[PDB]
Amino acid sequence: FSKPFMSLGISIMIKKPQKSKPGVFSFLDPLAYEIWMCIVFAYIGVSVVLF
Amino acid sequence: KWWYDKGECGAKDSGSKEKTSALSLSNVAGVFYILVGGLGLAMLVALIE
């Protein structure tokens, strides 16, 4: 054999994730998508109590 | 070898897996309950006064 012209090794291939950050759907992330409706219902109920 | 390497558990290595749960309603349920109790108590106090 001649001298090695191209050296190389063992590497790692992954799925390469992108910046998949959506818009409005990322806003209502941290609590729930259903606690807010009960919050609005208790809001209008307490307003009914006040009136 | 025959306990850790042969075993199927990778315990005490990983740690946190970011805990991707938003928020349960169990942190909110008793708070709703004391809200309803305060509203009903205020209703009864207003009616008796």
Burial label for B28, CB within 10 Å (0-12, 13-18, 19+), is: middle
**Long-range CB contact pairs, B18-25, < 8 A, 24+:** B22/A29, B22/A30, B22/A31, B22/A32, B23/A30, B23/A31, B23/A32, B23/A35, B25/A32, B25/A35
CB-CB under 8 Å, A38 with B22: no
| Residue B41 in contact with partner chain A when CB distance is under 8 A | no
3-state SS track over chain B: CCCCCCCCCCCCCCCCCCCCCCCCCHHHHHHHHHHHHHHHHHHHHHHHC
What method did the depositors use to determine the structure?
cryo-EM
Q: Which residue has the tokens 């992330």?
A: A29
Burial label for A14, CB within 10 Å (0-12, 13-18, 19+), is: exposed
Phi, psi torsion values for B20, nearest 5 degrees? -80, 50
Residue burial A16-39, b: 16+ Cβ < 10 Å; e: rest:
eeeeeeeeeeeeeeeebeebeeee
Residues of A in contact with B43 (CB under 8 A): 49
CB-CB under 8 Å, A46 with B39: yes
Q: Which of B9, B22, B36 is nearest to A46 (CA)?
A: B36
Contacting residues for B42 by C-beta, under 8 A, at least 6 apart: A49
Phi, psi torsion values for B34, nearest 5 degrees? -75, -25
| Residue B44 in contact with partner chain A when CB distance is under 8 A | no
Residue B40's Cβ-side half-sphere holds a number of Cα atoms within 13 Å equal to 6
| Residue B46 in contact with partner chain A when CB distance is under 8 A | no
